[model samples]
Target: GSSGSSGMEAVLNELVSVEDLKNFERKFQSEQAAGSVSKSTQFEYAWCLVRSKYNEDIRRGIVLLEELLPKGSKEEQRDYVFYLAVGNYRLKEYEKALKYVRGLLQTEPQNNQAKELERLIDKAMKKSGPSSG
Candidate 1:
């Protein structure tokens, strides 16, 4: 968000190797431990965890996204919700996935990715049958 800045301008300006990522994660965790973590830092850390694809990490990411979504920009909220849907899908949380997928489809009916995801969630839901308890 500066003069001639590419979206990855920060990455270009700094060495963003795996070591840097881990260092930043440690810093963020330290701030979190101190109860002074910035929301953006928290969200970024969570997104990285989500990308790691571990179940607990994804859940932590979802919690972070949920907290951020209420205060985020419209586009940011939409993007976060999309990630939430995908994360839930990966965890086989079909109901949660469907909820987020439907929210996205309601806003953009022609979104092919969300449409396809909704279809897949629907198929899974049907196969699971009506909730028995």
Candidate 2:
């Protein structure tokens, strides 16, 4: 989203502002603290964290992803799997990432973004993933 984000050799997008994360953090915890929630608000911050530059947030998202996992509308669950794949993708844990991809395809069947991301995971894999020891 600039001249070039020239560092990471991978398939991806950009991070949101820390301000946004902080705000989202507020919105998210507030829902829980209120003893009731949108569950959707929950997923929003989870998705935001999945795109974060830190593993702490990535794993944090995964936890939220699973907790709200067997979730709402079909589309909503699809989103769960989508970012489940991507958060793991960012972690370079392509094995688990691919598993999410397969399930996502079972439902979505034709999301170009997921399809593209699936290829991206494989591409990232062949370049330099864990080797037989």
Candidate 3:
């Protein structure tokens, strides 16, 4: 049987290398310059950008995802929140990562991936300092 981390692991594993990320970014730029980029396509671009090893690129992707959140469909919103959690986790912002994962879990109670992420963040919190309780 699959564990909670399976989905998250799968998504993370799907990410291309840095070189491919840069190539995708250039492709997105050209598409945007042509004024033919759909919001869904833009979301994909931002998703790939978020996987960058550089902090600046991750921040840029987070900003784009946030901007797209309100306007996105249910699926997109879920994806955005998931990536937001990932972005925060990547930065060691455990609280923010937990917040986003909690939100995602509220909507998808059985989302094992988000549940696993929440567990990881909670562990980080406990290790860092005093507990809320």
Candidate 4:
């Protein structure tokens, strides 16, 4: 973790690990395969895990937030990725922010909030370049 981007690796390791995710996915897959678990249930479980355990790690939390999307969540899929785009912007992942924020635009063409943020991110990218603060 100390070898990479600011707090990125720390967030990745502290609140979640590959093994932990694998275990969860294994259980998730088994349940889904058996039709014993619904997609909403899966998304909620993942959402709660991130919110409760990794609130401080916004990047990871945002990634988890994307789970609320997809299908069958009845969650309206809102602009969760817009929130994620903000996190990516903070992390100086401008391309990622641009990508997701553009996705938000696709969802709501008149989302002024995302549009403004996109403009800010665009300026940031032009000034600092991608992958660097």
Best by lDDT: 2
Residue-level lDDT of model 4, residues 2-49, one tens digit each, is 565333323323454445656665666688888776554465445434
Which 10-residue window of candidate 1 scores lowest in summed lDDT?
7-16
lDDT of 3: 0.76
Off by over 4 Å in 3: 1-6, 9-15, 128-133
lDDT of 2 by residue, 77-125 (tens): 8888888888998888899888988798888887766787788898998
Residue-level lDDT for 27 in candidate 3: 73
What are the lDDT figures for the candidates, one per model? Answer: 0.69, 0.80, 0.76, 0.60
Tell how far residue 105 is off in model 2, in angstroms.
1.2
The pairs that clash in candidate 1 are none
TM-score to native of every candidate shown = 0.66, 0.85, 0.79, 0.51
Off by over 4 Å in 4: 1-56, 71-75, 131-133
Candidates in order: C-alpha RMSD to true structure: 8.2, 3.4, 4.1, 9.3
Name the lDDT value of residue 17 in candidate 2: 59
Candidate 1 C-alpha lDDT tens digits along 1-133: 3565433222113322345457668868888798888877777766655555366766887888787888687877777777677667667787887888888778768767677778766776777745768
Location of the lowest summed lDDT over 10 successive residues in candidate 2: 5-14
